[PDB]
Structure 1
């Protein structure tokens, strides 16, 4: 497989090859719009491991957000508003420079029949998943609101429970 090489190469985030490509691609991405469709993911290993499949109904959108709330969470909500017919599946960092942080969001069309007939992505079609990025139900949204397991991570206490026989 060639995704073991891509996953290992992505760890050398500022090697000679990665720094040159990040500098080149940052210049190009700044030429295009703030939110623009990506013909294919720039990180086919990272998109693949986050649920993306190269089939119809799967949409990749790139976005840049100014540096200086979470940046990844801001990318997800702005892209989800941009194409409001799609469901935001996941997102990942692709590039950054002194001014901008670039992210790609994986969106899924819940009306396409290739999505509605796939039991592995059928869950996103249900209306309880409308705008998951707006309720913090994506990976970065869950991390942002301290959702997790362990000791690392109020209304029921402020109440006075008064039983019948007390």
Structure 2
């Protein structure tokens, strides 16, 4: 037990005791910096499913991002009318992934593993990101996360191998409809997404 009850509390927070908790917590988070390290996860069931243990080498980092889409900058030279838009654009990455990348900038000796949603507002979204030190012996002594010390896993979040990146790349659909997403997007000339 103790895990399904947390899952229940968070499956709809407006209905549980979590809404007002989150109101207060945000009152205090809005003053914090954009990337902040913490002691313990807020959604422990979800963390421990995504891969998180209470050993040395795991780090939890909250990130704040702004909501909505993009506003393109204006164009200097002449354009055709199908190419003048500035406002109603949206990004092709998700805010989850953008947050992961900001954290990866701030902690350079580390590597990202996964992330989970932890709050909303009218202007901001909040994600908690998990990270792992690949040069710790406690971490090189565990076969579940000893792959991460390899020579092809640095830049993971940047090339797109985290779950958010796979989602945004299209690697959750397998048959009809996903003819253009394997083995990659460049392989098909960006013609998927």
TM above 0.5, one fold? yes
| Cα RMSD, aligned residues only | 1.8
CA drift at 1:150: 2.5
Separation of aligned partners in 1, 2:125 and 2:59: 20
Q: 1:118 to 1:96 in 2, by over 3 A?
A: same
- Aligned pair partner of 1:78 in 90, 96, 102: 102
Q: Is the 8 A contact 2:57 2:138 kept in 1?
A: yes
Alignment correspondent of 2:117: 93
Alignment correspondent of 1:19: 19
Separation of aligned partners in 1, 2:2 and 2:42: 15
Q: 1:91 to 1:157 in 2, by over 3 A?
A: closer
Bigger Cα displacement from structure 2, 19-28 vs 59-68 = 19-28
Q: Is the 8 A contact 2:9 2:16 kept in 1?
A: no
Alignment correspondent of 2:79: none
CA drift at 1:76: 0.7
Separation of aligned partners in 2, 1:109 and 1:90: 14
| Unmatched segments (≥5 aa) in structure 2 | 69-90, 181-185
Q: Deviations over 1:91-146 (max 9, x none)?
A: 01101111100001000000111111111100111121102110110000000011
Q: 1:133 to 1:53 in 2, by over 3 A?
A: same
The equivalences for 1:44-63 within 5 A come to: 44-63=44-63
The equivalences for 1:96-107 within 5 A come to: 96-107=120-131
CA drift at 1:29: 1.3
Alignment correspondent of 1:145: 169
- Aligned pair partner of 2:137 in 98, 113, 116: 113
| Unmatched segments (≥5 aa) in structure 1 | 159-166
CA drift at 1:157: 8.3
Separation of aligned partners in 2, 1:157 and 1:127: 27
Separation of aligned partners in 2, 1:84 and 1:48: 24
Q: TM-score normalized by structure 2? A: 0.77
SS of match in other structure, 2:17: helix
The runs of at least 4 consecutive aligned structure 1 residues that moved more than 3 Å come to 154-158
- Structure that is richer in helix per residue: 1
